[PDB]
Amino acid sequence: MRIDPFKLAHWMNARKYTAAQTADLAGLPLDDLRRLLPAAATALAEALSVEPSQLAADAHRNLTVVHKSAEEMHASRRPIQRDGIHFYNYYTLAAPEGRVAPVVLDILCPSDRLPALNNGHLEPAITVNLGPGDINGRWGEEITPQTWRVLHANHGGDRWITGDSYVEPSYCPHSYSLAGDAPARIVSYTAQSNISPLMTEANNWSTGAFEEALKALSGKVSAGSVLDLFLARRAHTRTSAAEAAGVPPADLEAALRSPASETGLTVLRTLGRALGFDYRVLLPADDQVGKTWTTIEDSRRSRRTFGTYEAASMASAAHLPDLVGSFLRVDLIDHAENHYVVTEGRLTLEWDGPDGPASVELEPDGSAWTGPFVRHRWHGTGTVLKFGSGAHLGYQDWLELTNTFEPAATLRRGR
Amino acid sequence: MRIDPFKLAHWMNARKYTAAQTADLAGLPLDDLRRLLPAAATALAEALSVEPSQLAADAHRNLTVVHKSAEEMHASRRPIQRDGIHFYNYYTLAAPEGRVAPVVLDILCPSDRLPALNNGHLEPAITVNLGPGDINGRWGEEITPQTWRVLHANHGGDRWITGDSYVEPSYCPHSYSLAGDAPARIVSYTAQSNISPLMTEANNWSTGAFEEALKALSGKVSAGSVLDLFLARRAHTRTSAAEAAGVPPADLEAALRSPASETGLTVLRTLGRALGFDYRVLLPADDQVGKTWTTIEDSRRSRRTFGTYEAASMASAAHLPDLVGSFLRVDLIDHAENHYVVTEGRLTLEWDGPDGPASVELEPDGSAWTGPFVRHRWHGTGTVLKFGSGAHLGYQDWLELTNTFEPAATLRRGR
Structure with missing residues (x-):
């Protein structure tokens, strides 16, 4: 305190x-x-x-590294009953005390029972199939190719790529069952929600103000809609703003239809400099499970040497730049937090902390967390899952x- | 609780x-x-x-509007002694209980005494001269045209534009004195620091990790330096990233020298989509008191009709999109907080809150605060200063x- x-x-x-x-x-x-x-x-x-x-x-x-043995992970097991059956087991991976721990789940809903959905959660998550069995992913009440798809486990030889991965979208209810008799585990890794701080505050606004916010955020959130809010904020109209910046009204209108054309960008940056705002937030982002779906094949295809490691990509989304996952076959320094879980070998994680060089040996299911900018390395032979959030x-x-x-x-x- | x-x-x-x-x-x-x-x-x-x-x-x-009468503002007066003299009086404007209140200061250091500097503060601020007297601005130990400049008061007829304004940069020590015998007040309006949440966390990191962060943030923070951190984070090299995205190594290198050329932008967005990041943060911002200095003339020149109001601009900075100030001569809805102070007239501020239509009458020095997206309007005749932060x-x-x-x-x- x-x-x-x-x-x-x-x-x-x-x-x-x-x-x-x-x-x-x-x-x-x-x-x-x-x-x-x-x-x-x-x-x-x-x-x-x-x-x-x-x-x-x-x-x-002064936290640098937290770790959790395979034994301690297994000891964390908590069964979950849903729909009158033993539905999952939850295990927690290494995390600082009080922080959100990454989860491993035993998938126990059998293939002949439709997996009852959860309520959804705000945070997005990378979910990867650890195997050995294929599982069913469910994303809607009705069963369709859109709402029901098999997340495969790798059955072949390069098992360090464990299985399919995807991003669970924010808020949509989801659940998993076995696709066959073979058992299966997943890791579900959540990042912090970046919209959370805003929602926490908007929740405390008067209902009137909240409704006004939703109106301003309803429909297409375009270069034009956002700019108009920026202008009103500075007691400008589109007419006065274009005047202040030395920009013809028609070029402004053209810029707003094509913000990421270097002519659009030139106009918006000129306006931003004149009026005191950052033009970059006015530039287009990608329009909005199929898109982030990353197969075993996808991950094989992405294999590269990364320093002393071989790396392969899990699912990602450009809409979620803070959320990352990689398969690592065995210096590392990241600009935010890492959560690691060993899937093969007796591996040593070494780091430099407040007490000098330190290290821990971890076996499969053993896990670690590293703070932002904590220099570390893995020795041994050699598979770990690398997640990142923060x-x-x-x-x-x-x-x-x-x-x-x-x-x-x-x-x-x-x- | x-x-x-x-x-x-x-x-x-x-x-x-x-x-x-x-x-x-x-x-x-x-x-x-x-x-x-x-x-x-x-x-x-x-x-x-x-x-x-x-x-x-x-x-x-459920806060919508907080207000403070001219009387209550005057009652808040606190004298400040610095350098053995009565240096300023501080007055506080309307703010929610516990929040940072905007400040009015009497400038009392006379023209023949060099104003002793403060220690600086993290937050940037718009400072505007309310008059009636010109003041001296000080920004360094040695007195030079760079470190010593007169912030004029408006001596002419359109007094709703009260005087010169500028942005006090983050952390640099500053102070004010009278330029002559005529007395003078300023408003200094601080925005929240957007780097503050990061510093709060970085302060709790181990010294080792903190030093690593500073290294990664030292020198020119370019498209290339930032991208390389994004790549390492995803266990990619420049070679693998360009491969994954279907982009020739030479086009990537060209993109990084000119990120805001629509060819640069096309490459970076392609890379961002393939690798799961937002290309927009890789685009250039303006390189870094002369730039934000806004004279009385500047403000006159920016005059425009804004709905029922006439508006003129105070100082702004593109590097500080959340910090705004305007002179208003007398519906309003802003996407973040407003702080208003009446400089002329008996004005009525009307709003719609949880109890329906509400209103307050405020005289000069009387002030108000409005929450994000709180619809409001001013009636009467007619001058108020509009600040914005959040x-x-x-x-x-x-x-x-x-x-x-x-x-x-x-x-x-x-x-």
């Missing part, structure tokens, strides 16, 4: 209080405050008109970092 | 617990849980392995919303 020096300094600055004034208002010793930069937190919070949790330090500090550094952070003067210096200052 | 139904449901889903199991684990009545969807929070938190603040509802729910909906949210299938339906579901 500690105090974050960065958060404390922010609130002091926001209230425009000195350390002296802050100590005075909160009725605590000034030396305590200078050092912080449980009894202190409550007093500080009331003095700075914030909730104590607005001053709380993270429960986890808002930091996520693609939205990348947008902001490119808008930042000397990002490294800014980060250094905060710390 | 309430429970957020959305957060609770998220954690239950994340632990894969039913309502029954959750009630069981937390040892509370299942009817209480079904309804929630202080004694409950502590039990729930321990059951769901989260901190109670991960389940806390927002202190403010992460939701901010430009990063706009990037994510364009990556979302049926954003309106997703939002409706969360609520």
